[PDB]
Amino acid sequence: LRGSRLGAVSYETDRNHDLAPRQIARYRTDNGEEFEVPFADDAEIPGTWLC
Amino acid sequence: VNFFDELRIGLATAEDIRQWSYGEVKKPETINYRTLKPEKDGLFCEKIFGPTRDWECYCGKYKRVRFKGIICERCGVEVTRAKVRRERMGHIELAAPVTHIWYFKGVPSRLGYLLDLAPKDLEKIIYFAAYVITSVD
Amino acid sequence: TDEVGQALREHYPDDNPIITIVDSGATGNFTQTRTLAGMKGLVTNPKGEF
Amino acid sequence: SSNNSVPGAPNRVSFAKLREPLEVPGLLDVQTDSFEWLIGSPRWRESAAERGDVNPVGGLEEVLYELSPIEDFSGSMSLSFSDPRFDDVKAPVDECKDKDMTYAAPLFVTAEFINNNTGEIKSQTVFMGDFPMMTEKGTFIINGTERVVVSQLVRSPGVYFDETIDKSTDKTLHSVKVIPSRGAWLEFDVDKRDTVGVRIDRKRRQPVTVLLKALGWTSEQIVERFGFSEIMRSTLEKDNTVGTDEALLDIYRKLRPGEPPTKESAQTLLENLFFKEKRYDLARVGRYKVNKKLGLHVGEPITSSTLTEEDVVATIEYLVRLHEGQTTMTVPGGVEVPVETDDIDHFGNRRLRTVGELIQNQIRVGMSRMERVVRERMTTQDVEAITPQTLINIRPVVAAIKEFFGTSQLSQFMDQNNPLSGLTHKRRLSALGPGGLSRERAGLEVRDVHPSHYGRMCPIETPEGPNIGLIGSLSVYARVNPFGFIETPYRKVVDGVVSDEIVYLTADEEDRHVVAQANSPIDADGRFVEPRVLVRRKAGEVEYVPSSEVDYMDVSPRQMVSVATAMIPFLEHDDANRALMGANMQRQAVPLVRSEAPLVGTGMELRAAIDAGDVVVAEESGVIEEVSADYITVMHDNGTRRTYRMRKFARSNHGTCANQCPIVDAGDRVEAGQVIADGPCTDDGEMALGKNLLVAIMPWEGHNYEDAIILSNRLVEEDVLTSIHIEEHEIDARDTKLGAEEITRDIPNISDEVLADLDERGIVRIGAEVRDGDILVGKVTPKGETELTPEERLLRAIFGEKAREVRDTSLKVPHGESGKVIGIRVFSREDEDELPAGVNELVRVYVAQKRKISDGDKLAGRHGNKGVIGKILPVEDMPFLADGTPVDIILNTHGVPRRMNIGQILETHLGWCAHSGWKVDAAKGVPDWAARLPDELLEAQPNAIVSTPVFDGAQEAELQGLLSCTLPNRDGDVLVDADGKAMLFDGRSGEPFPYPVTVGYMYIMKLHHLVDDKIHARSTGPYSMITQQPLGGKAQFGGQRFGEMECWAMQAYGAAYTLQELLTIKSDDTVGRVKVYEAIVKGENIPEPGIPESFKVLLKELQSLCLNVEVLSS
Amino acid sequence: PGSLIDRAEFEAENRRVVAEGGEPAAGRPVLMGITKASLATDSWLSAASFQETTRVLTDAAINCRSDKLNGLKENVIIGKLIPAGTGINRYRNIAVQPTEEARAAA
Amino acid sequence: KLRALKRLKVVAAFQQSGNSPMGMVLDAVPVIPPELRPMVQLDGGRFATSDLNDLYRRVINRNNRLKRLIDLGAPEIIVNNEKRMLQESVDALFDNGRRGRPVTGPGNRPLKSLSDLLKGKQGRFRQNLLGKRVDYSGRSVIVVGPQL
Amino acid sequence: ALRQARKDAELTASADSVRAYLKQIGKVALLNAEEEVELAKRI
Ligand SMILES: [Zn+2]
């Protein structure tokens, strides 16, 4: 009786000494809620976002 | 990190519940029947709950640890480890208010004592069998 | 039952291995020896009576 | 003497002083007769014609007749059934067992659709489905496996008047529970006051008068029926309601809460619940019980399975007279009955749903579902276009049958460790299951032995675990009443001459009459000798009646006892606890490679083997044409010849061997009913579960300390105790999303060293010995595309090896296992074999090992002694006799007196007497002890088999006399003196032991609790699914539960860090376990524990229940 | 009135309340069973893990009762070191250095 | 008196601390993380739900249906029945076997709600938290070692 | 009397809630074709 979560665990080692630079965007709903999303730097920013 | 010293149980509020969650599940689907991948805005959605695999987004845009802590602009799942699927919670925004069962049915009823109402009658209220007056002028 | 057990107790020698085991304190009370030789005694009802 | 039946018997001399009027019945009749009653087999037809000819009717006929006819609500059409009929089985037994197909036969039913308004009959022969068929041995075969339907003890429907006391009032409160089958109860109780409660369907009581007026009794008729009854007239005054419909409306309100009452609805609903049979049916047994208890009908046949007003009013008046303290009672139109309370556990009230009754009930519920479907579609479908082919849906019936035989607590897996366990799994009564009480609902009072068990259910043999009393077995001579009760034979004695007219009584007639004892002095004429006689009365009392009122007599001793317990010699000397243990562990012996018959035994060693089924029996007399190790061709007296096929090295249901080798020669003449080939645990016809070993009873060097047993290496050298265990491994090549897997030799990275044993297309070669972790079935699956770690890419390119996109999941033989490979059974889709959906190729490999005896395996005799083997000594350091013969095992003495099982001593002494052989020198008459010995027992040969029946065996004086003269072995040397002891020589030191030691020949088995099945270890292995705890159960690697009590024990020591370890970094610290393994491998210090993955799951669940369980840091 | 409170807390409250205007609360010793004594404890984790988990959990949630994590059970549930035996600060914080004479010897 | 004592035990509980009693009624229902209610692919291409997915599916179905009913314009009877079923679904989610009948599944087996995972002898609170299967362990049958 | 028992049964708990829904729908009767025409014209 084996089982799996339909996922894969990568045996990679953390590399916090350098990551790709990440920009941060601020999205806002209609009712005055603020949300911060650390989007990718070399990526497009979708003005309409599901927060 | 340890340094555990106290645990404070307490009645959670709606503002706490929708502050715990990372998304709003709004579709009664779990997995696509043919490709065996979780559905969007479902009970297993990667955007809401985290990636199934390790450091991979849903459309596979970002597949390395160099891309971490960020959210793929298209598919919307934030690229991290896969243990977050054991910790990140969701929430359902109910369209009508509901009452908790522990504070109504468990004897002695707590709604009954708080409001000075009989449970034999409180059941008639909350299961839509009898009216109540919330204000008389 | 009492008097059968007493007669059995006064009949045995000291080097008898059953009574040697019992009197040594190693294991077993004398009632098991009384049930082995002599009289089983009074046996209980399923309800608890005799 | 001897057996004098079952030709081909071993000449086994018997110590039986008394006679055996009735031979033991067909042991497996409780299964076969019940099933052929269900079918309606002609043998059952003629037996029923012999014993009640008036209604010869099978169970399928009963369910069909109670079903027929089926009408719509309009009443303009009907559907009926008749004549159940079977074809032959579609496949034989062995092919069914090999190819995993259930052993069944089609059921053909004649259905008739009748229309009322225009008038037609639509008669067909509708295929009702495959019906599983019981084999010759009393077992069903489902999906290749063998299953046994265990007979169930239930509480019979009827009327049961019971009393309680009220400590607040000190009054006798009487009540009745008229419990039907699948109906609604009604209880008439007398409460604290002098009123009578008539609670109907569990809801808030009733005075009688409401129900009496509901049926249509006015107050004058209630006075006329109940005049003397003070409580009834008091309740008539207390009625506070006049008018029959005035009572009916109150009943409707109490029984239909939330329903607008109408006069017609209340008039019809009371009749619906109790008189309209579609929602109320107390069965044939219930009807018989009620009309016998109340004496309503005497010679009338059983019909109208519902209640009647006469029965209800008779019940009420019986209750009121039983509270009045009456002794007997006459109902008008019926013979009077005694007024008494009823025992909940007396066998007159505790019936036995056998296999036929259970399968009939399952068929009844399937037919009910099918009937709902058919009467739904009678209306919606157009008239003058339909036929029973279009109306009948057989899917729910076959679904119900399949759901009964598979996944039900009573369709149990057939337990074959030895043939005796196969015999005793059948003939077993179980009080738990669907329709019966569960173990948590089980009280203490149901688990006792009521005095009505004598001759109907053995009080010894019950499982020792949490099932004691809930599971027992039928007696040897027991037979089943057609109404589900347990009859018992008795010898009728008239005016003091013991006749031979054997009559069968259930428990009720055992109450009415009076019963004597078989071990009584019959004076060769049926006449008793002493007037003052041992006798049983109704309530279990034992007295001394004169030898004139005895009307019934026991058929024989050992009638109270079961089959397995009847095979214990000197049982009457054993205590009931150790006798229970001996009976429960006599069924756990394993089939050895030699299977030598016991020296001392009973008369049930022969008849528990020819009936168990695992001994091939010559069907009809003739001469042997030819023999082999595979088949026996017999030549019948009239032309025909028959080939009996053997079953060589077939795996049992618990991994043991099931060899069958012949015991006949090429010129021998056989008779019908003769043993022609021994079985797994059979020797020349009779059972042999163990070996005869030379036994001493001394405590030797502390190795036989506290039930431990030492053995000689002699049992290892000559394979005395050595079993052949056959294990079955299976693997299927199914389908998958990425493609299809293949059973091939193209496996990913493994050296070609381990591919030597595999044949050209996967699976191993037959006979290649395997060790733990070897490859059995080369099977590889696709994996897809996963990006590799960079260092894996570099290391692959360094040696040039490719990605090898497929992933190996081969059938590796699990850890802690070795042995040869007997047979390989491979299915395929290419041969068009029956495989489940999405499966391409199945293959099973049978790996067998010759498990010898070792230190740790469990050994046991026949009297509840048991022990793990402490030490296998060499042959030289073992206490040997004066002739140099070493003893084989050495038990302990301190376990004998305190367990009250000295039968093992007696079986020891007689064993030696049976080995050396005796000769009573009757030169001047016969000695005093041997006066009542049977003939040809005054002398015996060495190794001569003997037998002591259970409750009439060797007397102690006769044992002394036999032990006195025990003629010498080869020289003039009487090794064992009159006391039964011998002068042993210490094989280790050399000096003789200062005191003589008991020696003898004891028969000892090898239990199925071997070490190799129990030894278990895990450093790291698989992990659980939702929680991240280690798995368990030894099927995987698995770990031991460090439970709550061990947590308390470690807290009490003050052991803090060890507890922290055992609860954090060995079970749940998901990031910490890899750290502890790394720190151990690299030689560093064990990392500090973190928070477990159990507390975090608890935290997330608590947050899921809208409880803000936040941690404040400090 | 009718509520059951620890004797030490009762005495401490009386010492606090004799000042700022003196009035004594009247108390009577009670002998209670082991079930009710165990369930009426100060920590909600242990009582909830013992028996009647639903009611203990819900009334603890109402009371907002903060556990202090100082028994031998709530310290086992969360996996940190228990406050008994080798877990208490008297033995858990021992500084071990080689002795001066043998440190000089080395 | 006694009724006043019992009530005050709840009323004063809400007065002493900072809990508003508004949390007794519920507006947003949290959802447990997926890995605590996993959907696994067993060997054989099968699937095993964790029995909470069905209760959550019922709750989401009834909430979405209520949303559509209210947005469309629906009568008082249908909307009130839908609200009552939303209440019953949430009740079944938090604690099965309390109100009405236990919400059953296939084979007429009662479902396991969130309470039935905290409660019980086999629930987390009692064991699987106090007693656990452990690594670096084994077991075996035992014999006497009189020379040790 | 009988109508009093009818009114008493009219106010029950009915914990099933399908029976509660059925007793709720029992309030409103059926309609025939002409009133269907009238309702259709009105809507
Ligand atoms: Zn993406």
3-state secondary structure D734-747: EECCCCECEECCCC
B127 touching G, CB under 8 A?
yes
**Residue B47 alpha carbon to ligand 1 centre in Å:** 10
H or E segment and range at residue D510? helix D507-512
Alpha helix stretches (DSSP H) within D852-923 = 903-916
What tokens appear for D66 in the block?
């109670």
Specify whether the CB–CB gap between D209 and D236 falls below 8 A: yes
Q: Give yes or no for a contact between D566 and D952, defined as CB atoms under 8 angstroms apart.
A: no
Q: Tell me whether residues A12 and D789 touch, CB distance under 8 A.
A: yes
The alpha carbon dihedral of A11, A15, A21, A22 has a sign of: positive
How close is the Cα of A45 to the center of ligand 1, in Å? 13
Which residue in this structure is represented by tokens 């001897």? Answer: D2
Asked if residue D927 has a cis previous peptide bond (ω within 30° of 0), the answer is no
CA distance A38 to B69: 7
Strand, coil or helix: D313: helix
Pair D158, D290: CB distance under 8 Å: yes
Question: F77–G15: do the CB atoms touch at under 8 Å?
Answer: no
CA G22 to chain centre: 8
C-alpha B71 – ligand 1 centre gap (Å): 8
Q: D69: cis peptide before it, omega within 30°? A: yes
Question: Is residue B127 within 8 Å of residue G17, measured between CB atoms?
Answer: yes
HEC readout, D390-426: HHCCCHHHHHHHHHHHCCCCCEEECCCCCHHHHHHHC
D142 neighbors D412 (Cβ within 8 angstroms) = no
Q: Transcribe D473-491 into DSSP letters.
A: E--SS-EE-TTS-EEEEEE
- Do residues B104 and B35 touch, judged by C-beta distance below 8 A? no
Q: How close does chain A come to F42, measured CA to CA in Å?
A: 5
Report the distance separating Cα D472 and Cα D150, nearest Å: 11
* CA atoms of F10 and F18, how far apart (whole Å): 14
> In this complex, do G5 and D259 lie within 8 Å of one another by their Cβ atoms?
no
- Reported for D539-546, long-range contacts at CB under 8 A and 24+ positions apart, including other chains, are D539/D451, D540/D450, D540/D451, D540/D452, D545/D514
For residue C9, give the amino acid letter. Answer: R
Q: What are the structure tokens assigned to D723, written together?
A: 């079993």
Quick one: residue A5, left, alpha or beta (phi over 0 = left, psi -120 to 50 = alpha)?
alpha
Q: Can you tell me the distance from the alpha carbon of D978 to that of D965, in angstroms, rounded to the nearest whole number? A: 8
Identity at D407, one-letter amino acid code: T
Which chain D residues are closer than 8 Å to B2 by Cβ?
1090-1091
Q: Identify all chain A residues contacting B36, using CB atoms and an 8 Å cutoff.
A: 6
Nearest residue in chain E measured CA to CA from F126: E49
Residue type, F47: F
H-type helices in F33-124, by residue range? 52-72, 76-94, 115-118
Q: For residue G21, give the chain B residue with the closest CA.
A: B129
Helices and strands in chain G: count of H runs, count of E runs = 3, 0
d(C-alpha D1103, C-alpha G35), whole Å: 55
CA F58/CA D412 separation, integer angstroms:
37
- Burial per residue of F45-68, b for 16 or more beta-carbon CB atoms within 10 angstroms, e otherwise: eeeeebebbbbbbbbbebbeebbe
Widest distance between CA atoms in chain A: 51
Contact F129 E77 (CB under 8 A): yes
Our answer on whether A and G touch (3+ beta-carbon pairs < 8 Å) is no
What does the angle CA D1113 – CA E5 – CA E6 come to, to the nearest 5 degrees? Answer: 70
Q: Which two tokens stand for residue D1061?
A: 């370890």
CB D1036 within 8 A of CB D812: no
Is residue D1110 a contact partner of residue B5, using CB atoms and an 8 Å limit? no
Dist. CA D196–CA D187, nearest whole Å: 10
Task: Tell me if D1057 sits within 8 A of E81, measured CB to CB.
Answer: yes
Name the minimum distance, in Å, from the CA of E61 to any CA of chain D. Answer: 7
The set of residues, in sequence order, having a beta carbon less than 8 Å from that of D710 and lying 6+ positions away, is D700, D703, D704, D869, D870, D871, D872, D873, D889, D890
Residues D349/D342, Cβ–Cβ less than 8 Å: yes
Cβ distance D258 to G5 less than 8 Å, yes or no, reads no
Q: D251 is written with which tokens?
A: 């009943």
CB contact under 8 A, D786 and A8: yes
DSSP 8-state secondary structure symbol assigned to residue F136 = S
CA of A35 to the centre of ligand 1 (A): 20
Buried b (16+ CB within 10 A) or exposed e, F6-35: ebebbeebbeeeebebebbebbbbbbbbbb
Residue in this structure with the two tokens 């019979």, named with its chain if needed: D156
Which residues have CB under 8 Å from D412's CB, separation 6+?
D147, D148, D149, D150, D425
What's the CA-to-centroid distance between B83 and ligand 1, angstroms? 19
The two tokens of residue G36 are 């269907």
| Angle at CA of residue F20, ends F18 and F21, nearest 5° | 135
Strand-pairing partners, residue B69, are none
Residue type for B26, please? K
Question: What angle (nearest 5°) sits at the alpha carbon of residue C34, between those of residues C31 and C35?
Answer: 90
Strand partners, D509: none
Distance between CA atoms of residues F82 and B96, nearest Å: 10
From D484, D517, D894, select the one nearest D706 (Cα to Cα): D894
CA–CA gap between residue F125 and residue D1095 (Å, rounded): 9
B99:F34 CB<8 A: no
* B53/B64 Cα distance (integer angstroms): 11
Counting Cα atoms < 13 Å in the Cβ hemisphere of F11 gives 11
The amino acid that residue B136 corresponds to is V
Chains D and G touch (3+ CB pairs under 8 A): yes
Residue of C nearest to D706 (CA): C27
Measured over the CA atoms of residue E65, residue E66, residue E71 and residue E75, the dihedral's sign is positive
Q: Inform me whether the C-beta atom of residue B121 falls under 8 Å from chain G C-beta atoms.
A: no
Pull the structure tokens for residue B58.
């849903």
Greatest extent of chain G over all pairs of C-alpha atoms, in Å? 44
Q: Say how far apart CA D1083 and CA D10 lie, in whole Å.
A: 69
Is B7 within 8 Å of E45 when comparing Cβ atoms?
yes
Contact between D128 and D173 (Cβ < 8 Å): no
Please report the beta strands in D713-862, taking only residues with DSSP state E, as ranges in sequence order. 723-734, 742-743, 775-777, 779-782, 806-808, 811-812, 820-826, 839-851, 858-860
Nearest CB neighbour to F43, from listed A2, A5, A6: A2
CA distances for D1111 relative to B2, E67, F114, angstroms:
11, 9, 21
Nearest Cα residue to D603 out of D952, D357, D857: D952
CB D477 within 8 Å of CB D604: no
DSSP-H helix ranges across D749-860: 790-799
The helix (run of H) or strand (run of E) holding residue D122 is: strand D120-123
Q: Is G20 on the interface with B (CB under 8 A)?
A: yes
What tokens appear for D450 in the block? 């009521």
Specify binding-site residues of B.
Answer: 57, 59, 72, 75
Going by their DSSP bridges, the two strands D811-812 and D820-826 should be labelled as unpaired
8-state DSSP, B78: B
Are D291 and D306 in contact by the 8 Å Cβ rule? The answer is no
Report the C-alpha dihedral over residues D243, D244, D247, D251, rounded to 10 degrees: -160
Burial of E31: CB neighbours in 10 Å, binned 0-12, 13-18, 19+: exposed
Across the interface, of F33, F59, F91, the residue whose CB is closest to B86 is F33
D585/F148 Cα distance (integer angstroms) = 31
CB D212 within 8 A of CB D218: no
DSSP annotation string for D238-285: TT---SHHHHHHHHHHHHSTTS---HHHHHHHHHHHHTSGGG----HH
C-beta separation of F32 from B23 below 8 A: no
CA dist D1001 → D202, D867, D889, D900, D1009 (Å):
64, 18, 10, 20, 24
Using H for helix, E for strand and C for coil, what is the string for D214-251? HHCCCHHHHHHHCCCCHHHHHHHHCCCCCCHHHHHHHH
Residue from D736, C34, D810, D880 nearest F43 by CA? D736
Please tell me if residue E8 touches chain B, with a CB cutoff of 8 Å.
no
List all residues of chain F from 66 to 125 with a beta carbon under 8 Å from chain B.
66-67, 70, 80-81, 83-84, 86-88, 90-91, 94-95, 98-99
Non-local (6+) Cβ contacts of E7 within 8 A are: E27
Judged on CB neighbours under 10 Å (0-12, 13-18, 19+), F140 is: exposed
Angle between helices F52-72 and F76-94 (to 10 degrees): 160
d(CA D3, CA D605): 11
CB F136 within 8 A of CB D1066: yes
| Chain centroid to CA D1035 | 25
- Enumerate the known binding-site residues of B for Zn(2+): 57, 59, 72, 75
**Six-digit token string for D626:** 């030819």
Q: Which chains touch B (3 or more CB pairs under 8 A)?
A: A, D, E, F, G
CB-based neighbours (< 5 A) of ligand 1, an ion? B 57, 59, 61, 72, 75
Chain gaps in chain F, named by the residue before each (C–N > 2.5 Å): none
Adjacent-strand bridge partners of D121:
D114
Is E106 within 8 Å of E98 (Cβ atoms)? yes
- Breaks after residues in chain G, judged by C–N over 2.5 Å: none
CB-based burial, C5-41: b 16+ in 10 Å, e otherwise: beebeeeeeeeeebbebbeeeeebeeebbbbbebeee
PDB resolution in Å: 3.4
Beta bridge partners of D277: none
Amino acid identity, position D723: S
The token duo for D133 is: 């068929």
Residues 6 or more apart whose CB falls under 8 angstroms from that of D720 comprise: D592, D594, D691, D693, D714, D853, D888
- Rounded to an integer, what distance in angstroms lies between the CA atom of residue B38 and that of residue B47? 10
Cross-chain CB nearest to F83 (options B44, B96, B111): B96
Sheet (strand D641-645) strand order: D641-645, D631-636, D622-627, D669-670
Smallest Cα–Cα separation from A46: which of D1040, D418, B72?
Answer: B72
CA D592 remoteness from chain centre = 24
| Letter string b/e over residues D445-466, b meaning 16 or more CB atoms within 10 A of that residue's CB | ebeebbbbbbbbbbbbbbeeee
- CA B45 / ligand 1 centre spacing (Å): 13
Phi, psi of F139 (to 5 degrees): -150, 155
Question: What is the C-alpha separation between D593 and D550, in angstroms, rounded?
Answer: 52
Beta strands D946-947; D600-601: pairing state? parallel
| CA distances, D741 to each of B34, D744, D838, D839, F42 (Å) | 19, 9, 11, 10, 16
Q: Is the dihedral of CA D330, D331, D337, D343 positive or negative?
A: negative
Place of tokens 């006799």: D881
Cα D1039 to Cα D1042: distance, rounded to the nearest angstrom: 9
**Token pair recorded at residue D89:** 């089985």
Shortest CA distance to D847 belongs to which of D1011, D729, D765? D729
Taking the CA atoms of residue D23, residue D25, residue D27 and residue D29 in that order, the dihedral angle to the nearest 10 degrees is 170
Residue D629 CB partners (closer than 8 Å, separation 6+)? D646, D648, D661, D662
